[PDB]
């Protein structure tokens, strides 16, 4: 319902002038809005918390405690896990738990999995650490 | 030596008007600045990362993988680990690794331990789960 800029405004993590400056730049550059905001000083975690709320994802402050379930990992080929930015990590109540790197990929991943799923969002470094543990390059 | 408010303002978690507002409220209520800011929308994790930076602590996002070394837990009576909010979890390079629940207790704990130490900080639930693991019963 709410766009990213409005979400951040509502949470008090950007100012109206900071948002307008970003939207004015975007209309000249076409860069992703969150990228402009972060480049101008928005904490990257603030961006991801807002993006998670927008797509109904649970934001994961860390992936270090996750022990990836090998049987969940079989639900995506490694090449697909990397391309879609999705790590299946386990099961809860007959749903597969999946950690995304980019909320914009939730729908594409959900369609692919074609089963009940619970989605999480992790920061880039946290996501890559998790991916490598779930999908060793071996 | 930056105070918490300007630490958070520089990062961009709070506006300047929100900081002034929170300190004005604190003048009436006396609550901690971090608790007011968290009530006003600051993530608790962002608060603890700033508090860790301020006191030279390493903030731990998670304690789930830590297996507490019993040899290190011996360095504090359980009663002291609870009162000081400090869990010794192991040793690195001749320093004892200690996980604090509150960065304000760093100096008191360091004086007591009286040996080289590496200090970490953890959010309350993660700290409690680690404390029960290191100091069972
Ligand atoms: N992984 C990742 N995802 C990002 C990032 N920035 C945005 N996303 C998401 O990608 C979608 C397209 O972003 P946009 O290209 O900047 O296109 C934006 C942007 O041009 C504009 N916009 C965003 N917020 C506002 C606002 O508050 N006010 C106005 N007038 N326009 C806004 O509306 C369009 C739709 O925005 P949204 O519905 O929120 O949809 C956004 C948002 O869900 C990022 O840095 N990283
Ligand atoms: N466990 C926990 N610890 C917390 C929390 N908030 C602060 N601490 C820490 O406790 C000390 C006392 O916080 P305070 O009572 O709000 O008393 C504060 C506060 O009244 C004020 N203050 C803090 N930041 C600012 C600022 O940016 N500008 C101004 N003018 N005053 C500030 O200076 C005094 C000292 O602030 P600090 O040096 O940063 O020292 C702070 C900080 O290290 C919390 O929510 N939980």
Residue numbers in the entry:
A (entry chain A): 165 to 302
B (entry chain B): 165 to 301
The paper states:
The traffic ATPase PilF from Thermus thermophilus is important for type IV pilus biogenesis, twitching motility, surface attachment, and natural DNA-uptake and contains three consecutive homologous GPSII domains. The N-terminal part of PilF harbors a remarkable arrangement of three successive general secretory pathway II (GSPII) domains (GSPII-A to GSPII-C) with high sequence similarity to each other. Interestingly, we find that PilF binds only two molecules of c-di-GMP with different affinities and that the c-di-GMP–binding activities can be attributed to the GSPII-B and GSPII-C domains. Remarkably, the GSPII-B domain binds c-di-GMP with a KD of only 6 nM and thus with an affinity ∼ 83fold higher than MshEN.
Initially, we introduced arginine residues at these positions to reestablish an MshEN-like binding mode. We found a 25-fold higher KD value of 150 ± 7 nM for K167R compared to the WT (6 nM) and a 4-fold higher KD value of 23 ± 2 nM for L196R. The PilF159-302 K167R variant crystallized well and diffracted up to 1.8 Å with the macromolecular chain being traceable from residue 165 to 301 without interruption. The structure of chain A showed that in this mutant R167 is indeed involved in a cation-π-stacking interaction with the GMP1 guanine base. However, only partial electron density is observed for the side chain of R167 and the neighboring E170 in chain B of the crystal structure and there the R167 side chain guanidine group appears to be oriented towards a phosphate group of the ligand. Thus, the R167 stacking interaction with the guanine base of the ligand seems to be more dynamic and less energetically favorable than the equivalent interaction in the WT. In comparison to MshEN (chain A), the arginine side chain in chain A is positioned more towards the center of the guanine base. This is most likely due to the presence of E170, which positions R167 by forming simultaneous hydrogen bonds with its backbone amide and the guanidinium group of its side chain. The loss of binding affinity for PilF159-302 K167R in combination with the presence of a more dynamic cation-π-stacking interaction of R167 on the guanine base of GMP1 indicate that a lysine side chain at this position is beneficial for c-di-GMP binding most likely due to the presence of more extensive hydrophobic interactions.
